[PDB]
């Protein structure tokens, strides 16, 4: 049985535990290609089910995702409960190495769910986004305001009846919003932001803006300060909202890949990988070994690129302005290889449904060998010159520290999670794309996640990625770069150019789109900045019915107020430098 086969996961012990606790008629098991047990729960039992899952002997400790779905236009809902809308909750048990998706059905008139924030504190921003884009209210939310769109926005854009395209520009509304920006500070009240006890008459409220662009993007933080100390802060995000999920409903399965590239714009093929894996699950495609090795090599090259930018920008944020020049030279060596292979630098859009766009060009191994010879001396030089400097250490060690429990309750993944001692990397826990055939280690911290431990963990991750790249260079399999499946999009170009049935398949795949049979698929990968996941719902058409992108930077930015409370503003900017986020990842 292939890994993409539709399964109900009734053999999962969590299904038997839920049946013993709540009864057989309390929930409905849905068969998916998500790889996880999908369980439809009544709305009135959601908090009970969540508490039961949190109190299991090997408990579900992290709320991985929480979002909504407009099911009104979905025609293939066989075996599913009646629902105009739905809200899903993806929960992860690291100790079990398992996960469960809970789905709550909602009628159009009764669009309210109990809040999940008492069980999982990252449900705050997840429910705010679900309210913003779908109009689903969450009862008991401390402050349920829009998080992506401005507060004076009409409608909920992820609803199926909301038009996707840009509306006509108007200078009058730009003038009005400029006036709101001008008198935003004059009419600032802490109550609408969730802040309290401000203006005591000792705290000040200070807004941060687009004044420190360290390649992360534009966003705002309003800080409540007792003198120099942060007593509370909320981040203002949505300034980088691109409507990428709505675009997922707007593009074909093939023509959405460039948009996947720009979700986390320092990641490239890393961003492409979960989307094409989830589409290949929908299509029932198993890629050959050469495709797996090529995709792993591209992912690790882009992981090294992103880590180089992250480490150098952290060093620049601390104050040492020199290593960014050399690290971008190393990024140019990576770009030499990536340009030669894919034809592009930052957004290659090179992965395909069923494979990659072209075969490897002749001479790729020379460029890979040159980069693998160039990198280690440069990395050691950066370590000795900057990361072992005691001023940088005094600026970063012990700054914005959190443990394993705080990382689990906020959905922190990647190096921030592993610096707390939790050994959870997707490439080892849930292997994908042939990562199990590579010899590499997962660096973990001592139990405490500071700025410094996160940065050094990413340095060790860079070294491990260099090891994986060495293995990719030494053992690259001979074979096809595209699968021999009819839904491989596009087909191999030479057969398209001389064979009529292949030309027909190409013609219909690039124009109307490949038809993905109606299913739900999920793919989780270890991205550059944490765990990135694609959750795709196909309604049997050539476009996605729903494209949900879970990004780790959203969770990290939500964790910011809990970790930085009681610190200084300098600690905050160092913390932002050490998070490894981009605003495109946060806002999608």
């Amino acid at each position: 049985e292939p890994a993409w086969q539709t399964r109900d996961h009734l053999d999962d012990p969590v299904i038997g535990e839920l049946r013993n606790r709540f009864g057989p008629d309390a929930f409905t098991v849905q068969a998916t290609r998500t790889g996880v047990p999908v369980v439809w729960i009544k709305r009135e039992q959601l908090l009970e089910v969540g508490d039961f899952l949190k109190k299991l002997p090997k408990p579900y400790v992290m709320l991985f995702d929480l979002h909504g779905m407009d099911e009104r236009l979905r025609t293939h809902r066989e075996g599913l409960p009646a629902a105009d809308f739905s809200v899903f909750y993806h929960l992860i048990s690291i100790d079990r190495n398992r996960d469960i998706m809970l789905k709550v059905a909602l009628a159009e008139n009764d669009l309210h769910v109990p809040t999940f924030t008492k069980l999982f504190p990252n449900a705050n921003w997840y429910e705010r986004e679900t309210w913003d884009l779908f109009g689903i209210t969450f009862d008991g939310h401390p402050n349920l305001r829009r998080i992506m769109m401005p507060q004076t926005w009409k409608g909920h854009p992820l609803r199926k009846d909301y038009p996707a395209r840009a509306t006509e520009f108007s200078p009058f509304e730009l003038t009005k919003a400029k006036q709101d920006l001008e008198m935003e500070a004059l009419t600032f009240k802490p109550e609408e932001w969730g802040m309290k006890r401000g203006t005591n008459e000792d705290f000040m409220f200070l807004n941060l803006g687009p004044n420190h662009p360290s390649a992360h993007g534009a966003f705002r933080i309003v800080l409540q300060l007792d003198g120099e100390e942060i007593v509370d802060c909320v981040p203002d995000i949505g300034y980088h909202h691109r409507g990428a999920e709505k675009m997922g409903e707007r593009q074909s399965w093939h023509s959405y890949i460039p948009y996947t590239d720009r979700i986390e714009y320092l990641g490239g093929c890393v961003n492409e990988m979960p989307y094409v894996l989830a589409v290949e699950k929908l299509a029932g495609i198993t890629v050959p070994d050469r495709v797996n090795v090529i995709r792993v090599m591209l992912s690790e090259l882009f992981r090294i690129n992103s880590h180089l930018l992250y480490i150098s920008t952290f060093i620049q944020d601390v104050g040492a302005m020199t290593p960014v020049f050399f690290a971008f030279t190393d990024r140019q060596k990576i770009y030499d290889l990536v340009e030669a292979i894919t034809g592009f630098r930052m957004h290659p859009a090179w992965f395909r449904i069923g494979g990659v766009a072209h075969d490897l060009p002749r001479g790729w191994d020379r460029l890979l060998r040159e980069f693998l010879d160039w990198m280690p001396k440069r990395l050691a030089s950066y370590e000795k010159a900057a990361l072992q400097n005691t001023i940088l250490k005094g600026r970063s060690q012990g700054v914005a520290a959190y443990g394993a429990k705080e990382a689990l309750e906020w959905g922190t993944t990647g190096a921030g999670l592993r610096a707390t001692g939790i050994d959870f990397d997707v490439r080892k826990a849930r292997p994908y794309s042939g990562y199990e055939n590579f010899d590499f280690e997962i660096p973990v911290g001592g139990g405490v996640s500071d700025c410094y431990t996160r940065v050094m963990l990413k340095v060790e991750e860079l070294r491990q990625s260099l090891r994986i790249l060495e293995q990719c260079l030494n053992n690259m399999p001979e074979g096809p770069f595209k699968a021999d499946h009819p839904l491989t999009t596009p087909p191999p170009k030479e057969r398209t150019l001389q064979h009529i049935e292949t030309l027909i398949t190409h013609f219909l795949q690039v124009s109307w789109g490949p038809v993905m049979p109606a299913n739900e698929s999920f793919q989780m990968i270890e991205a550059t900045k944490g765990i990135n996941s694609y959750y795709l719902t196909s309604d049997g058409s050539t476009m996605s019915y729903r494209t949900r992108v879970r990004t780790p930077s959203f969770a990290h930015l939500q964790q910011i107020p809990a970790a930085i409370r009681g610190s200084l503003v300098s600690d905050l900017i160092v913390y932002l430098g050490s998070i490894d986020f981009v605003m495109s990842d946060v806002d999608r």
Partner: protein, 905 residues
């Protein structure tokens, strides 16, 4: 019946085959040679499924689902591995000889063969040998021929010969060298040849008119519309690209036209793309023609109309119900005139009275195929109401259908039905001034003048019922033919009487009403059909008004000093000299039209109205069904200087500017509400389509496919800034892809058929409740009137027989599908298909005048000595001259008129 497909239970009709039953259930089985309207023949072998004897059977056997009845307790599997392998092998065998042609093939993106190649999963070629090749034929100006792409599915010949009764298309050769086409190069002679471009699943037969300005299906902007070229009211999907009307596709209406159009509707759309159309309001100031915008045109027209002492309005059967009503409201009911002549108005109102007061049910176009005997009186149906002629051919094949049903043959086994029937057919009797295209299947044809055809109808009615008035002076041979018709009509379970206004005779319609009444009095399930002239002839008849002669009298006497002519060239309904003199006498002529007509030279103001592609409205077809047509595209999207509005919008704004000195562009639903409030006989046009607030789960209905391309480049040469999406306040459709076109959406107006995996016209299967039936949530369009409880009295005005007077030549109308309709004859592709102008003569009359075939003779009508070449008509009765109605220079009002000094030029 109960079937089990892949272990799932389904309830189906046992009289259906497994292919149409499984397609009606939403299951996907690839198929080529089967069509819902043509039956099953089992040729292509694509539709293989695995049938098991019972539930406890694992072996099974491969069967053709189209040839297998969907009987009770039938166990089949579609997703069986051997069935999937065989279906892929059938696609592969078709692919061995198929040309590498998809980029340069007009079927691409709309091709059933492409869809089934992808559906079977065949994408790898292992055949390595040569491909067979064919030369192409020239098939005329409408259909392009490319025999390389043929998969030998036999759909074309089955449709063209067995369905449409065409004679000049066939299959030649044998084995893998079978050829589909004409026996030699020439134009396809069938009036329904254009349906080949949708019947053929490949790109062999393609739309040449679309091929000139070709674009793919995903790039089209579609709207549900009604064909404007005659009164039948076939549902169409016009598709536009880059501001020009590109194609007319068939829009499935299970009540009216189902799968098929006629060639006039399919190819006569070219007048929309004419470059001489008015695009802006133009005011004639002396010898100058200045261009106005909408507001100042309204202000100037309103000022001049306010200064006038009496304003009259002249409507047209070309215009919609809303436009004619808006003109009637602008000028007043007592000042409103229908644009047709007095005799045409009398015939149209008599046909209307027979339809909605005769007590006899009038069938829809699909229902015509279920009648057991047909009498056509006077109306050359193939040239005037062509789709009715196609339906009549199906009703004629009903006898073979009944004979095969007596022998327990399934209704989809079409070859067995045709073999059992042989040449047997239901009785058909056609009367005309000459031969018709229905003479090949008619049991009898009566070639006679219109008075003699009416007398034959009156005699048939009298022999059916003695209370009907008798006819004196019937010859014994004609009496024997009358008796043959009488026993054929009396023995029929469902007789159908077809007539219309195109014969130019009131007595023909009266005789048809008498025959229908006599059949109704005997307890028969009789139906009556009236063929009108134009798309909204019945709507103009229901609205009523004075004739064009009265309007010209008002203009000539000086009682009216302002005339507003709506969508009427005025020369088809009255003599051109009288019209020109009356319009020159009037100090204000305003012409609201979308075509450059001859009366615009003397017009003081010309309002650039919208054609059907750029407008919304309602039209009433020949059976009284109100149907809404929706705007296809915004004419101002590319050319921002284009001020081309709906006629009702122009006239409503003119009325508002005349009354309150303020402009009011209004909304379509407001005008429809005004129509149904003021005219109760048109109250059913409210329910022809839902209003503009209708939504499918909150979203509008999309006009263009979801893969519509070039949004940020199609207007980039004009400006790199993308314009605002055109807003549609009038209807529930949006001028974008951001809308709903799901086959399961609860609606009746479908702009185009597309489903995932079905890009061809076969997606209409997904849009239907059952395949070949109706649309899933009802066919659009409602009937204005029900059958009345009581009928009319017998018409006692039996005319005298035709007598040839010396020196006077009675004009016999000859209609042409390509040429008689005004707008379609303006289409450039129709000029090659148009017959050359002529005059038909009896051999005795031509010998008396000393002329041969081809000699040019001259005649004077209303002081216009015009010269035409003579051709000899064998079937025309002496004392008559055959003239082609509706052509250039020959108005349709000349039918039934008389000619003087007809002599050799």
């Amino acid at each position: 019946a109960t079937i089990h497909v892949d272990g799932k239970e389904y309830e189906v009709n046992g009289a259906d085959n497994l292919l149409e039953a499984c397609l009606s259930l939403g299951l996907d089985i690839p198929y080529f040679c089967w069509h819902p309207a043509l039956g099953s023949v089992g040729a292509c072998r694509q539709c293989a499924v695995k049938q098991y004897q019972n539930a406890e059977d694992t072996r099974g056997r491969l069967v053709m689902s189209c040839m297998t009845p969907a009987s009770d307790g039938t166990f089949i599997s579609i997703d069986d591995e051997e069935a999937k392998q065989f279906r892929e092998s059938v696609v592969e065998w078709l692919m061995t000889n198929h040309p590498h042609d998809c980029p340069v093939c007009e079927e691409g993106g709309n091709c059933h063969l492409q869809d089934m190649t992808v559906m079977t999963g065949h994408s790898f070629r292992r055949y390595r040998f040569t491909k067979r090749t064919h030369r192409n034929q020239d098939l005329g100006p409408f259909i392009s021929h490319e025999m390389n792409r043929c998969i030998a599915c036999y759909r074309c010949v089955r449709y063209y010969k067995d369905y449409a009764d065409g004679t000049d298309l066939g299959v030649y050769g044998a084995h893998d060298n079978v050829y589909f086409g004409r026996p030699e190069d020439g134009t396809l002679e069938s009036e329904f040849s254009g349906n080949l471009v949708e019947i053929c699943p490949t790109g062999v037969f393609t739309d040449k008119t679309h091929s000139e300005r070709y674009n793919r299906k995903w790039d089209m902007q579609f709207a549900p519309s009604i064909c404007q070229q005659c009164s039948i009211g076939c549902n169409i999907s016009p598709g536009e690209r880059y501001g020009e009307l590109r194609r007319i596709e068939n829009r499935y209406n299970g009540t009216v036209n189902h799968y098929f159009l006629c060639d006039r509707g399919r190819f006569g759309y070219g007048y929309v793309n004419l470059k001489d159309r008015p695009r802006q309001p133009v005011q004639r100031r002396g010898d100058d023609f200045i261009t106005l915008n909408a507001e100042q045109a309204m202000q100037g027209a309103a000022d001049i109309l306010r200064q006038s002492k009496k304003v009259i309005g002249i409507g047209s059967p070309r215009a919609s119900v809303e436009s004619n009503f808006a003109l009637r409201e602008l000028v007043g009911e007592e000042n409103f005139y229908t644009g047709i002549a007095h005799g045409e108005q009398e015939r149209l109102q008599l046909a209307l009275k027979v339809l909605r007061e005769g007590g006899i049910y009038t069938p829809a176009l699909r229902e015509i195929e279920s009648y057991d005997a047909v009498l056509v009186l006077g109306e050359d149906v193939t040239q005037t109401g062509a789709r009715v002629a196609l339906a009549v051919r199906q009703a004629v094949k009903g006898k073979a259908r009944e004979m095969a049903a007596a022998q327990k043959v399934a209704d989809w086994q079409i070859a067995a039905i045709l073999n059992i029937g042989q040449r047997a057919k239901h009785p058909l009797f056609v009367t005309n001034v000459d031969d018709t295209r229905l003479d090949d299947i008619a049991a009898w044809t009566y070639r006679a003048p219109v008075e003699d055809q009416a007398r034959l109808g009156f005699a048939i009615a009298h022999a059916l019922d003695n209370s009907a008035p008798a006819v004196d002076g019937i010859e014994p041979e004609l009496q024997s033919k009358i008796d043959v018709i009488v026993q054929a009509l009396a023995g029929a379970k469902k007789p159908l009487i077809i007539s219309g206004t195109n014969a130019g005779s009131l007595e023909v319609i009266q005789a048809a009403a008498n025959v229908a009444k006599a059949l109704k009095g005997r307890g028969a399930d009789v139906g009556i059909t009236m063929i009108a002239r134009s798309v909204n002839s019945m709507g103009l008849g229901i609205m009523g008004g004075g004739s064009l002669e009265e309007a010209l009298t008002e203009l000539e006497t000086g009682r009216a000093d302002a005339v507003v002519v709506l969508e009427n060239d005025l020369h088809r309904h009255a003599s051109a000299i009288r019209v020109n003199a009356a319009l020159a006498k009037a100090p204000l002529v305003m012409v609201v039209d979308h075509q450059r007509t001859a009366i615009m030279e003397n017009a003081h103001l010309v309002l650039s109205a919208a054609s059907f592609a750029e407008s919304d409205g309602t039209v009433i077809n020949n059976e009284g069904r109100a149907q809404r047509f929706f705007q296809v595209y915004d004419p101002a999207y590319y050319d921002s200087k284009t001020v081309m509005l709906e006629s009702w919008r122009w006239l409503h704004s003119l009325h508002s500017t005349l009354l309150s000195r303020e402009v009011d562009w209004t909304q379509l639903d407001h005008v429809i509400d005004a129509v149904v409030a003021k005219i109760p006989e048109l109250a059913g046009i409210k329910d022809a389509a839902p209003d503009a607030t209708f939504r499918i789960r909150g979203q509008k209905l999309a006009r263009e496919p979801h893969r519509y391309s070039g949004r940020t480049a199609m207007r980039a040469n004009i400006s790199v800034h993308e314009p605002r999406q055109p807003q549609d306040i009038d209807t529930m459709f949006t001028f974008s892809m951001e809308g709903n076109n799901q086959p399961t959406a609860h609606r009746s107006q479908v702009p185009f058929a597309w489903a995932p995996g079905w890009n061809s016209p076969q997606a209409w299967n997904k849009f239907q409740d059952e395949v070949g039936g109706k649309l899933r949530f009802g066919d659009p369009g409602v009937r204005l009137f029900e059958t009345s409880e009581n009928g009319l009295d017998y018409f006692t005005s039996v005319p005298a027989r035709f007598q040839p007077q010396d020196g006077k030549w009675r004009i016999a109308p000859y209609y042409h599908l390509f040429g008689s309709d005004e707008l379609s004859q303006r289409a450039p592709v129709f000029q090659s298909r148009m017959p050359q102008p002529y005059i038909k003569l009896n051999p005795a009359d031509a010998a008396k005048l000393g002329v041969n075939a081809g000699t040019r003779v001259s005649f004077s009508y209303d002081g216009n000595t015009v010269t035409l070449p003579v051709e000899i008509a064998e079937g025309l009765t002496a004392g008559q001259v055959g003239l082609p109605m509706g052509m250039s220079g020959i108005a349709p009002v000349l039918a039934g008129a008389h000619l003087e000094d007809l002599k050799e030029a």
